[PDB]
Ligand binder design. Structure first.
Ligand SMILES: CCN(CC)CCNC(=O)c1c(C)[nH]c(/C=C2\C(=O)Nc3ccc(F)cc32)c1C
Length: 303
């Protein structure tokens, strides 16, 4: 799984009174995403936060063929979920069924519109830079800004997202977007955004260079990812580096300071933003804390 704590800053038990939730107050439904051993299922959960009100949630759980190895992975996600705590632009934990005699289940915010990529890619027809339902440039700046913030909070809690992409970002009601980690519920052996490298399969289009050549994950080799994330947005859900075969070659030109062109809906400011994020030197490219403001700036400038 992908959202983990920053190793740049290592080196507390589970609070059941605050988190544990009755498997008999939880009603399972359709799968939203299946991966290999994991799956996110849509659920209805009674009085999980408002006494006596039902509530549509998303429950993370194992599926068939998982081993205790997975189960421990899922015990981990809950743990860091509890760590990071509530922010609005990230997915939040609602509660957990960690009782014996039952499947481990982590319950998290449901997002009615799913991941951003597939959402924008569907909105290509209904867009305009400046009529209800339609996407505008105001929205696009806004989403970007929300993720920066989300990424910032995600930093403040000493975490890193080792797979930051528009496909791991969800849209819910009222134009809120939340950073998430599909974790086990994403199969990388079946998603082409993930390239085989040995038996490791990596989101290479998103991965910053230092991460690729060496394997240095940092809040900053994330900004790069976020630069790429910005592209996906102002292309309305287009996959990065079109046509370009991702190979020993690709990686080369990348550190020759070679970047993608501009996406179809980008503004000039946005594109240059994307270009900072894609600095060779991981230090030169801004902090998410700094992107939060520029985008805040840009969002005011778009009326
Ligand atoms: C044609 C479009 N479809 C209509 C039937 C839309 C389908 N909807 C979907 O695919 C979908 C929806 C509505 N939610 C999710 C995922 C998550 C969610 O909600 N909270 C999370 C929290 C954490 C996490 F790691 C994933 C999720 C999907 C994949």
């Amino acid at each position: 799984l992908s959202i983990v704590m920053d190793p740049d800053e290592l080196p507390l038990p589970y609070d059941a009174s605050k988190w544990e939730f009755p498997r008999d107050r939880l009603k399972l439904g359709k799968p939203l995403g299946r991966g290999a051993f994991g799956q996110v299922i849509e659920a209805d959960a009674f009085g999980i936060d408002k006494t006596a009100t039902c509530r549509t949630v998303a429950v993370k759980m194992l599926k068939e063929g998982a081993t205790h190895s997975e189960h421990r992975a899922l015990m981990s996600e809950l743990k860091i979920l509890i760590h990071i705590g509530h922010h609005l632009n990230v997915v939040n934990l609602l509660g957990a069924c960690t009782k014996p005699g039952g499947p481990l289940m982590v319950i998290v915010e449901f997002c009615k519109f799913g991941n951003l990529s597939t959402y924008l890619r569907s909105k290509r027809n209904e867009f305009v830079p400046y009529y209800k339902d339609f996407l505008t440039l105001e929205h696009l700046i806004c989403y970007s800004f929300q993720v920066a913030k989300g990424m910032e909070f995600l930093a403040s809690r000493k975490c890193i997202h080792r797979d930051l992409a528009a496909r791991n970002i969800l849209l819910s009601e009222k134009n809120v977007v939340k950073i998430c980690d599909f974790g086990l519920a994403r199969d990388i052996y079946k998603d082409p955004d993930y390239v085989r490298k040995g038996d490791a399969r990596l989101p290479l289009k998103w991965m910053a260079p230092e991460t690729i050549f060496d394997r240095v994950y940092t809040i900053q080799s994330d900004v790069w990812s976020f630069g790429v994330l910005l592209w996906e947005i102002f292309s309305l859900g287009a996959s990065p580096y079109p046509g370009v075969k991702i190979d020993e070659e690709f990686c080369r030109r990348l550190k020759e300071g070679t970047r993608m062109r501009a996406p179809d809906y980008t503004t000039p400011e946005m594109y240059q933003t994307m270009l900072d994020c894609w600095h060779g030197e991981p230090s030169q490219r801004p902090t998410f804390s700094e992107l939060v403001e520029h985008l805040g700036n840009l969002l005011q400038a778009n009326a």
